[PDB]
């Protein structure tokens, strides 16, 4: 380890002499208290260290020790059910050993070093292993955590620890070249974990919400952007997505949130229940929490820490949903760091490389073939919070250039008690065409046509808004009144979804397909009845209205019979009509 | 804030911190940064201004296992009434809502000149209701907001189309807006309990016809609707 | 126009005034349309009386 | 200006100084300042531009006991016709008023295209009035300014509501503004005495009702109001 002494202190900037051999962006311990800093410039025998925490009280001549490694995360058993800050320090153990305040220079381990894990070997002496292979398994809540050899490590197995209880520091496998492999390894957060091959967006990411799964789908391994306007129910929708998605592991990243909003996340999330097991949802999620008053380095590194953890869980063969609660706050942290570096800004004070960093974060998503030969995916749902909802902000423009879906959350819809408050007019998805074969194979060959028909009906309803504003709906022709009423039905019975209801919180693709079938069949029958001289108000009184309105709340296993009965009675109700 | 934290979390005090002018603080921060040869960020302010303001603001809150609390009311004058100025912008980024003073209300002789329409408390729902203030608080506030917005819009409409062309309910909203400004906002130096404020709000809502109160449940309407302003007001 | 911060604020105030004028004109249009729809029923009654 | 001061204050000459383009002077000043890395004002001009322009402009005037005088008429081209550009801004802050030309007036064939509203003379009050030009000069000037500004405002209103919707007072002010621009400002190369100019001004003011002339005292109105514009010509 390169060891030097402090030569100059100027705020968070420390110049350390005697540091020849220190590498750029290595983590350093500054002063007797061991404050963590990063090398950002090398000059002769000196190194420029940017200290994470406050440097008040430091004196010239205090030791500077280089760890020799860049910013990295420990990947191994013990991350699930854990809460970390932006640089992966366990907040609960920090509270245990320090109090209600976070003191400077506290040393904690990301993975617990005292807990014993039930090791089960899967390799034998003489076996040849490569990066990403499975050395063994360890139980962690409902999962079987696969211990992977690090991606850059290969060799022949010499000795394997038998089944038993060991800590993460115990060398379970040691290779012929003397390399010891433990239950965990470290990976730089700014280097993407290698994969064999990136797959195409063929399969959908099922969030359990009808509007998202049908109108604006995101592919497994895709990326979606959401806005967080106040009063839109963003937190309900985010935690509903966490509960009901088809992802095995959830990673939630809070980059520089408000103190009370971060408290809301940290209190509500442990109370969520996992429907797959009935236990706490926290048993399959990792929370990364940062408030606005934490060091800017941690707030900037939070998303990379989260995406690295997500990539590790993907490399174990799982499907991971990654949610970043505010990339706008992360961008603010990046802007502050660039300003501290005295870099010329681009547009509204942001560094010119803002789009490059956003792309480096978002492009780590995708369905891949892991180095171990299994299949895994990372799906990223990012959130943006412009100053006053003005999307023209460079962060939002940069995000929308690279994300495949945009779920426009609207406060006006939430004011009208339309939940989820997703404005279907401003939302879009680029994954529909790629996902169409999967829909035809897996739910119905008709499904894309039905989805386009429903979207066209919504567009026709939106095209009449100025007429309905100018004159009442009763002044509309029966054809226009029919599409207005069908748009109302579509909204209130397909688009709206109760996140707290016992059966309506989740909706499968087939149930949604049946609902659209019922709605479109009713619309076609009513359009025929209109040209049969039937007036609108007898159609609006049909019980099939209430039948379609109740289709949301019927359970999943009872839906097929309800759907066939409803189709039959919708066919019958219009035949008997005069 | 050091004194506030000490009191609240070592003696269980409920501490209210008032920071009288954060604009002066930010100008001092800019001057200090310039004096130390630092390159400024947006609009000449330090690039770390957001972090500094966060380290000030985020010292308030409630701690698990502690009876005390710290509440902050920062006060800042927007440099040109510009909400997009960096100081109010970053403050809104960090804080939970804002109370906006109205120059129009102030010049009309109303004190305190708080304008309810642009004001917002983001944590309000968590601190009101049954067992905290009263069960009808939230719905009353929503109804007041909607009725006041309706009244202020009808006030601009009446200038062009005249009072006689208005609907009867429009005239009711017009009278409600004036009474709301004169009695609810314009309280002077009075110290009003929450019960007195709710009573005045209900008396103001009673000027509207029953059933126009869409945001309020029928139980609360039956319990509190009907009373006149004359019976409970401080002065005519 | 000379680009200055004060001028920028003036233009933003003008934009706000224009938006409020649009809203006010829309409300006036709503009132006019209500009057027009009453008057059309009055006109149809008058036309029927003329036919008689 | 050294020559002008020498002549005026040593040989009692009345000197008129014309500086063709102070914009070109400020360009050279900016070149020197940028070569010297001076802390700039706005748009890259050196911070000491105000002081330098002051050392130039402040060399005019009259001196107690001496008979000569120095009168300065600098000329400067406002970049993009922007009055808030640093050069015209600092010049206006230093000089005793300015004569501002209007491109809109010029495009209409009016010469000299002097726009009176942005124009100013700080020393006007010292040289006009009873015993200097005429007793009604200042009041007539004030009334003309108010009436012309009213006409310009009504021109702005016309673009929104159309001319046919105007009242008779607004129409009278609009016609006053038009006739003012066409007859008072537009004079060509002819040399008008102050009496002729005041006669034209009173003829234009007679277009308005006698009660609208709030700026003018009633005795002056009785003396001069009522004359027709056709009597001067046509």
Coordinates of N, CA and C in Angstrom, one line a residue, chain A residues 176-347:
Chain A
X176 N -5.3 -24.0 -7.8 CA -3.9 -24.5 -7.8 C -2.9 -23.4 -7.7
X177 N -3.1 -22.3 -8.4 CA -2.2 -21.2 -8.3 C -2.2 -20.4 -7.0
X178 N -2.9 -21.0 -6.0 CA -2.9 -20.3 -4.7 C -4.0 -19.3 -4.5
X179 N -4.8 -19.1 -5.5 CA -5.9 -18.1 -5.4 C -7.0 -18.6 -4.5
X180 N -7.3 -17.9 -3.4 CA -8.4 -18.2 -2.5 C -9.7 -17.5 -2.9
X181 N -10.8 -18.3 -3.0 CA -12.1 -17.8 -3.4 C -13.0 -17.9 -2.2
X182 N -13.6 -16.8 -1.8 CA -14.4 -16.7 -0.7 C -15.9 -16.7 -1.1
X183 N -16.8 -16.5 -0.2 CA -18.2 -16.4 -0.5 C -18.5 -15.1 -1.2
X184 N -17.6 -14.1 -1.1 CA -17.9 -12.8 -1.7 C -16.6 -12.3 -2.4
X185 N -16.8 -11.4 -3.3 CA -15.7 -10.7 -4.0 C -16.1 -9.2 -4.2
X186 N -15.2 -8.4 -4.6 CA -15.4 -7.0 -4.8 C -15.3 -6.6 -6.3
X187 N -16.2 -5.7 -6.7 CA -16.2 -5.3 -8.1 C -16.3 -3.8 -8.2
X188 N -15.5 -3.1 -9.0 CA -15.7 -1.7 -9.2 C -17.0 -1.3 -9.7
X189 N -17.6 -0.3 -9.1 CA -19.0 0.1 -9.5 C -19.1 0.8 -10.8
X190 N -18.0 1.3 -11.4 CA -18.1 2.0 -12.7 C -17.7 1.1 -13.8
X191 N -17.5 -0.2 -13.6 CA -17.2 -1.1 -14.7 C -18.3 -2.1 -14.7
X192 N -18.9 -2.2 -15.9 CA -20.1 -3.2 -16.1 C -19.6 -4.6 -16.0
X193 N -20.3 -5.4 -15.3 CA -20.0 -6.8 -15.2 C -20.1 -7.6 -16.5
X194 N -19.2 -8.3 -16.9 CA -19.2 -9.0 -18.3 C -20.3 -10.1 -18.3
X195 N -20.8 -10.2 -19.6 CA -21.8 -11.3 -19.9 C -21.4 -12.0 -21.1
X196 N -21.9 -13.2 -21.4 CA -21.6 -13.9 -22.6 C -22.2 -13.2 -23.8
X197 N -23.5 -12.8 -23.7 CA -24.2 -12.2 -24.9 C -25.4 -11.5 -24.3
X198 N -25.7 -10.3 -24.9 CA -27.0 -9.6 -24.6 C -28.1 -10.0 -25.6
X199 N -29.2 -10.3 -25.0 CA -30.4 -10.9 -25.7 C -31.3 -9.8 -26.2
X200 N -32.2 -10.1 -27.1 CA -33.1 -9.2 -27.6 C -34.3 -8.9 -26.7
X201 N -35.0 -7.8 -26.8 CA -36.2 -7.6 -26.0 C -37.4 -8.4 -26.5
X202 N -37.4 -9.7 -26.2 CA -38.5 -10.5 -26.7 C -39.6 -10.7 -25.7
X203 N -39.3 -10.9 -24.4 CA -40.3 -11.2 -23.4 C -40.6 -9.9 -22.6
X204 N -41.9 -9.7 -22.2 CA -42.3 -8.5 -21.5 C -41.9 -8.6 -20.0
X205 N -41.8 -7.4 -19.4 CA -41.7 -7.2 -18.0 C -43.0 -6.9 -17.5
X206 N -43.6 -7.8 -16.7 CA -45.0 -7.8 -16.3 C -45.1 -7.1 -14.9
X207 N -45.6 -5.9 -14.9 CA -45.7 -5.1 -13.6 C -46.9 -5.4 -12.9
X208 N -47.9 -6.1 -13.5 CA -49.2 -6.4 -12.8 C -50.2 -5.3 -12.9
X209 N -49.9 -4.2 -13.6 CA -50.8 -3.1 -13.8 C -51.2 -3.1 -15.3
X210 N -52.6 -2.9 -15.5 CA -53.1 -3.1 -16.8 C -52.6 -2.1 -17.8
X211 N -52.6 -0.8 -17.3 CA -52.2 0.3 -18.3 C -50.7 0.1 -18.7
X212 N -49.9 -0.2 -17.7 CA -48.5 -0.4 -18.0 C -48.2 -1.7 -18.9
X213 N -48.9 -2.8 -18.5 CA -48.6 -4.0 -19.2 C -49.2 -4.1 -20.6
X214 N -50.3 -3.3 -20.8 CA -51.0 -3.4 -22.1 C -50.7 -2.2 -23.0
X215 N -51.0 -1.0 -22.5 CA -50.8 0.2 -23.4 C -49.4 0.6 -23.6
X216 N -48.5 0.5 -22.5 CA -47.2 1.0 -22.6 C -46.2 -0.1 -22.0
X217 N -46.1 -1.2 -22.6 CA -45.3 -2.3 -22.0 C -43.8 -2.0 -22.1
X218 N -43.1 -2.6 -21.1 CA -41.6 -2.5 -21.1 C -41.1 -4.0 -21.2
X219 N -40.2 -4.2 -22.1 CA -39.6 -5.5 -22.2 C -38.7 -5.9 -21.0
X220 N -38.6 -7.2 -20.8 CA -37.7 -7.7 -19.7 C -36.3 -7.3 -20.1
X221 N -35.6 -6.5 -19.2 CA -34.4 -5.9 -19.5 C -34.5 -4.6 -20.2
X222 N -35.7 -4.0 -20.3 CA -35.8 -2.7 -20.9 C -35.7 -1.6 -19.8
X223 N -35.8 -0.4 -20.3 CA -35.7 0.8 -19.4 C -37.0 1.6 -19.6
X224 N -37.5 2.2 -18.4 CA -38.6 3.1 -18.4 C -38.3 4.3 -17.6
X225 N -38.9 5.4 -17.9 CA -38.7 6.6 -17.2 C -40.1 7.1 -16.7
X226 N -40.1 7.6 -15.4 CA -41.4 8.0 -14.8 C -41.1 9.4 -14.2
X227 N -42.1 10.3 -14.3 CA -41.9 11.6 -13.6 C -42.6 11.5 -12.2
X228 N -42.0 12.1 -11.2 CA -42.5 12.2 -9.9 C -43.1 13.5 -9.4
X229 N -44.3 13.9 -10.0 CA -45.0 15.1 -9.5 C -45.7 14.8 -8.2
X230 N -45.7 15.8 -7.3 CA -46.3 15.6 -6.0 C -47.8 15.4 -6.1
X231 N -48.3 14.4 -5.4 CA -49.8 14.1 -5.4 C -50.2 13.2 -6.5
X232 N -49.3 12.5 -7.1 CA -49.6 11.6 -8.3 C -49.7 10.2 -7.8
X233 N -49.4 9.9 -6.6 CA -49.4 8.5 -6.1 C -48.1 7.8 -6.6
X234 N -47.0 8.5 -6.9 CA -45.8 7.8 -7.5 C -45.4 6.7 -6.5
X235 N -45.4 6.9 -5.2 CA -44.9 5.9 -4.3 C -45.8 4.7 -4.2
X236 N -47.1 4.9 -4.3 CA -48.0 3.7 -4.4 C -47.7 2.9 -5.6
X237 N -47.5 3.6 -6.8 CA -47.3 2.8 -8.0 C -45.9 2.1 -7.9
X238 N -44.9 2.8 -7.4 CA -43.6 2.2 -7.3 C -43.6 1.0 -6.4
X239 N -44.2 1.0 -5.3 CA -44.2 -0.1 -4.4 C -45.2 -1.2 -4.9
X240 N -46.2 -0.8 -5.7 CA -47.0 -1.8 -6.3 C -46.2 -2.6 -7.4
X241 N -45.4 -1.9 -8.2 CA -44.5 -2.5 -9.1 C -43.5 -3.4 -8.4
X242 N -43.0 -3.0 -7.3 CA -42.1 -3.8 -6.5 C -42.7 -5.1 -6.1
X243 N -44.0 -5.0 -5.6 CA -44.7 -6.1 -5.1 C -45.1 -7.1 -6.2
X244 N -45.6 -6.6 -7.2 CA -46.3 -7.5 -8.2 C -45.6 -7.8 -9.5
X245 N -44.4 -7.3 -9.6 CA -43.6 -7.5 -10.9 C -43.1 -9.0 -10.9
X246 N -42.7 -9.4 -12.1 CA -42.2 -10.8 -12.2 C -40.7 -10.8 -12.1
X247 N -40.2 -9.9 -11.3 CA -38.8 -9.9 -11.0 C -38.5 -10.6 -9.7
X248 N -37.4 -11.4 -9.6 CA -37.1 -12.1 -8.4 C -36.5 -11.2 -7.3
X249 N -35.7 -10.3 -7.7 CA -35.0 -9.4 -6.7 C -35.3 -8.0 -7.1
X250 N -35.6 -7.1 -6.1 CA -35.8 -5.7 -6.3 C -34.7 -4.9 -5.7
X251 N -34.1 -4.0 -6.5 CA -33.1 -3.1 -6.0 C -33.7 -1.7 -6.1
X252 N -33.8 -1.0 -4.9 CA -34.3 0.4 -4.9 C -33.2 1.3 -4.5
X253 N -33.0 2.4 -5.3 CA -31.9 3.3 -5.1 C -32.6 4.7 -4.8
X254 N -32.3 5.2 -3.7 CA -32.7 6.6 -3.3 C -31.5 7.5 -3.4
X255 N -31.4 8.3 -4.4 CA -30.3 9.2 -4.6 C -30.7 10.6 -4.1
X256 N -30.2 11.0 -2.9 CA -30.4 12.3 -2.4 C -31.8 12.8 -2.2
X257 N -32.7 11.9 -1.6 CA -34.1 12.2 -1.4 C -34.2 13.2 -0.2
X258 N -35.4 13.7 -0.1 CA -35.8 14.5 1.1 C -35.7 13.6 2.3
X259 N -35.4 14.1 3.4 CA -35.3 13.3 4.6 C -36.6 12.6 5.0
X260 N -37.7 13.3 4.9 CA -39.0 12.7 5.2 C -39.5 11.8 4.1
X261 N -39.2 12.0 2.9 CA -39.5 11.1 1.8 C -38.7 9.8 2.0
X262 N -37.4 9.9 2.3 CA -36.6 8.7 2.5 C -37.1 8.0 3.7
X263 N -37.5 8.7 4.8 CA -38.1 8.0 5.9 C -39.4 7.3 5.5
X264 N -40.2 7.9 4.7 CA -41.4 7.2 4.2 C -41.1 5.9 3.5
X265 N -40.0 6.0 2.6 CA -39.6 4.7 2.0 C -39.1 3.7 3.0
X266 N -38.3 4.1 3.9 CA -37.7 3.2 4.8 C -38.7 2.6 5.9
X267 N -39.8 3.3 6.0 CA -40.8 2.8 7.0 C -41.9 2.0 6.3
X268 N -42.3 2.4 5.1 CA -43.4 1.7 4.4 C -42.9 0.4 3.8
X269 N -41.7 0.4 3.3 CA -41.2 -0.8 2.5 C -41.1 -2.1 3.4
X270 N -40.6 -2.0 4.7 CA -40.7 -3.2 5.5 C -42.1 -3.7 5.8
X271 N -43.1 -2.9 5.7 CA -44.5 -3.4 5.9 C -45.1 -4.0 4.7
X272 N -44.5 -3.9 3.5 CA -45.0 -4.6 2.3 C -44.8 -6.1 2.5
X273 N -45.8 -6.9 1.9 CA -45.7 -8.3 2.0 C -45.5 -8.9 0.6
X274 N -44.7 -9.9 0.5 CA -44.3 -10.6 -0.7 C -45.4 -11.6 -1.0
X275 N -46.2 -11.4 -2.1 CA -47.3 -12.4 -2.4 C -46.8 -13.8 -2.8
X276 N -45.5 -14.0 -3.2 CA -45.0 -15.3 -3.6 C -44.8 -16.2 -2.3
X277 N -44.4 -15.6 -1.2 CA -44.2 -16.3 0.0 C -45.1 -15.9 1.2
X278 N -45.7 -14.7 1.1 CA -46.5 -14.2 2.2 C -45.7 -13.5 3.3
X279 N -44.3 -13.6 3.3 CA -43.5 -12.9 4.2 C -43.2 -11.5 3.8
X280 N -42.3 -10.8 4.5 CA -41.9 -9.5 4.2 C -41.4 -9.4 2.7
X281 N -41.7 -8.3 2.1 CA -41.2 -8.0 0.7 C -39.7 -7.7 0.9
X282 N -39.2 -7.2 2.0 CA -37.9 -6.8 2.2 C -36.9 -8.0 2.1
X283 N -37.4 -9.2 2.2 CA -36.5 -10.4 2.2 C -36.0 -10.6 0.8
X284 N -36.5 -9.9 -0.3 CA -35.9 -10.0 -1.6 C -35.6 -8.6 -2.2
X285 N -35.4 -7.6 -1.4 CA -35.0 -6.3 -1.9 C -33.8 -5.8 -1.2
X286 N -33.0 -4.9 -1.9 CA -31.9 -4.2 -1.3 C -32.3 -2.7 -1.4
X287 N -32.2 -2.0 -0.3 CA -32.5 -0.6 -0.3 C -31.2 0.2 -0.2
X288 N -31.1 1.2 -1.1 CA -30.0 2.2 -1.0 C -30.6 3.5 -0.7
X289 N -30.2 4.1 0.4 CA -30.9 5.3 0.9 C -29.9 6.4 1.1
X290 N -30.2 7.6 0.5 CA -29.3 8.8 0.7 C -30.3 10.0 0.9
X291 N -29.9 10.8 1.8 CA -30.6 12.1 2.0 C -29.8 13.2 1.3
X292 N -30.4 14.4 1.3 CA -29.7 15.5 0.6 C -28.5 16.0 1.3
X293 N -28.4 15.7 2.6 CA -27.3 16.2 3.4 C -26.1 15.2 3.6
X294 N -26.2 14.0 2.9 CA -25.1 13.1 2.9 C -24.0 13.6 1.9
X295 N -22.8 13.1 2.0 CA -21.7 13.5 1.1 C -22.1 13.3 -0.4
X296 N -21.7 14.3 -1.2 CA -22.1 14.3 -2.6 C -21.5 13.1 -3.4
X297 N -20.4 12.6 -2.9 CA -19.8 11.5 -3.6 C -20.7 10.2 -3.5
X298 N -21.2 10.0 -2.3 CA -22.1 8.9 -2.1 C -23.4 9.0 -2.9
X299 N -24.0 10.2 -3.0 CA -25.2 10.5 -3.7 C -24.9 10.3 -5.2
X300 N -23.7 10.6 -5.7 CA -23.4 10.4 -7.1 C -23.1 8.9 -7.4
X301 N -22.6 8.2 -6.4 CA -22.2 6.8 -6.7 C -23.4 5.8 -6.4
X302 N -24.5 6.3 -5.8 CA -25.6 5.5 -5.4 C -26.1 4.6 -6.6
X303 N -26.4 5.3 -7.7 CA -27.0 4.5 -8.8 C -26.0 3.5 -9.4
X304 N -24.7 3.8 -9.4 CA -23.8 2.8 -9.9 C -23.7 1.6 -8.9
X305 N -23.7 1.9 -7.6 CA -23.8 0.8 -6.6 C -25.0 -0.1 -6.8
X306 N -26.1 0.6 -7.0 CA -27.4 -0.2 -7.2 C -27.3 -1.0 -8.5
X307 N -26.9 -0.4 -9.6 CA -26.8 -1.2 -10.8 C -25.8 -2.3 -10.7
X308 N -24.7 -2.1 -10.0 CA -23.7 -3.2 -9.8 C -24.3 -4.4 -9.0
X309 N -25.1 -4.0 -8.0 CA -25.7 -5.1 -7.2 C -26.8 -5.8 -8.1
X310 N -27.5 -5.1 -8.9 CA -28.5 -5.7 -9.7 C -27.8 -6.6 -10.8
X311 N -26.7 -6.1 -11.3 CA -26.0 -6.9 -12.3 C -25.4 -8.2 -11.6
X312 N -25.0 -8.1 -10.4 CA -24.6 -9.4 -9.7 C -25.7 -10.3 -9.5
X313 N -26.9 -9.8 -9.1 CA -28.0 -10.7 -8.9 C -28.5 -11.3 -10.3
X314 N -28.4 -10.5 -11.4 CA -28.6 -11.0 -12.7 C -27.7 -12.1 -13.1
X315 N -26.4 -11.9 -12.8 CA -25.4 -13.0 -13.0 C -25.6 -14.2 -12.2
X316 N -26.4 -14.1 -11.1 CA -26.8 -15.4 -10.5 C -28.0 -16.0 -11.2
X317 N -28.5 -15.4 -12.3 CA -29.6 -16.1 -13.0 C -30.9 -15.6 -12.7
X318 N -31.1 -14.5 -11.9 CA -32.4 -14.0 -11.6 C -32.8 -12.8 -12.5
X319 N -34.1 -12.4 -12.4 CA -34.6 -11.2 -13.0 C -34.7 -10.1 -11.9
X320 N -34.1 -9.0 -12.2 CA -33.9 -7.9 -11.2 C -34.6 -6.7 -11.7
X321 N -35.4 -6.1 -10.9 CA -36.1 -4.8 -11.1 C -35.3 -3.7 -10.3
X322 N -34.8 -2.7 -11.0 CA -34.0 -1.7 -10.4 C -34.8 -0.4 -10.6
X323 N -35.1 0.3 -9.4 CA -35.8 1.5 -9.4 C -34.9 2.6 -8.8
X324 N -34.8 3.7 -9.5 CA -34.0 4.9 -9.1 C -35.0 6.0 -8.8
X325 N -35.2 6.4 -7.6 CA -36.3 7.2 -7.2 C -36.2 8.7 -7.7
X326 N -34.9 9.2 -7.9 CA -34.8 10.5 -8.5 C -33.4 10.5 -9.2
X327 N -33.4 10.4 -10.5 CA -32.2 10.7 -11.3 C -31.9 12.1 -11.4
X328 N -32.9 13.0 -11.1 CA -32.6 14.4 -11.1 C -31.8 14.8 -9.9
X329 N -32.0 14.2 -8.8 CA -31.1 14.5 -7.6 C -29.7 14.0 -7.9
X330 N -29.6 12.8 -8.5 CA -28.3 12.3 -8.9 C -27.6 13.2 -9.9
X331 N -28.3 13.8 -10.8 CA -27.8 14.7 -11.7 C -27.3 16.0 -11.0
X332 N -28.1 16.4 -10.0 CA -27.7 17.6 -9.2 C -26.4 17.3 -8.5
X333 N -26.2 16.1 -8.0 CA -24.9 15.7 -7.3 C -23.8 15.7 -8.3
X334 N -24.1 15.2 -9.5 CA -23.0 15.2 -10.6 C -22.6 16.6 -11.0
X335 N -23.6 17.5 -11.1 CA -23.4 18.9 -11.4 C -22.5 19.5 -10.3
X336 N -22.8 19.3 -9.1 CA -22.0 19.8 -8.0 C -20.6 19.3 -8.0
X337 N -20.4 18.0 -8.3 CA -19.0 17.5 -8.4 C -18.3 18.1 -9.5
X338 N -18.9 18.3 -10.7 CA -18.3 18.9 -11.8 C -17.9 20.3 -11.5
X339 N -18.8 21.1 -10.8 CA -18.5 22.4 -10.4 C -17.3 22.5 -9.5
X340 N -17.2 21.5 -8.6 CA -16.0 21.5 -7.7 C -14.7 21.2 -8.5
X341 N -14.8 20.5 -9.6 CA -13.7 20.2 -10.5 C -13.4 21.4 -11.4
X342 N -14.2 22.5 -11.4 CA -14.0 23.7 -12.2 C -14.1 23.3 -13.7
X343 N -15.1 22.5 -14.1 CA -15.3 22.2 -15.5 C -16.3 23.1 -16.1
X344 N -16.1 23.4 -17.4 CA -17.0 24.3 -18.1 C -18.3 23.6 -18.3
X345 N -19.4 24.2 -17.9 CA -20.7 23.6 -17.9 C -21.3 23.6 -19.3
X346 N -22.3 22.7 -19.5 CA -23.1 22.6 -20.7 C -24.5 22.8 -20.4
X347 N -25.2 23.6 -21.1 CA -26.6 24.0 -20.9 C -26.8 24.5 -19.5

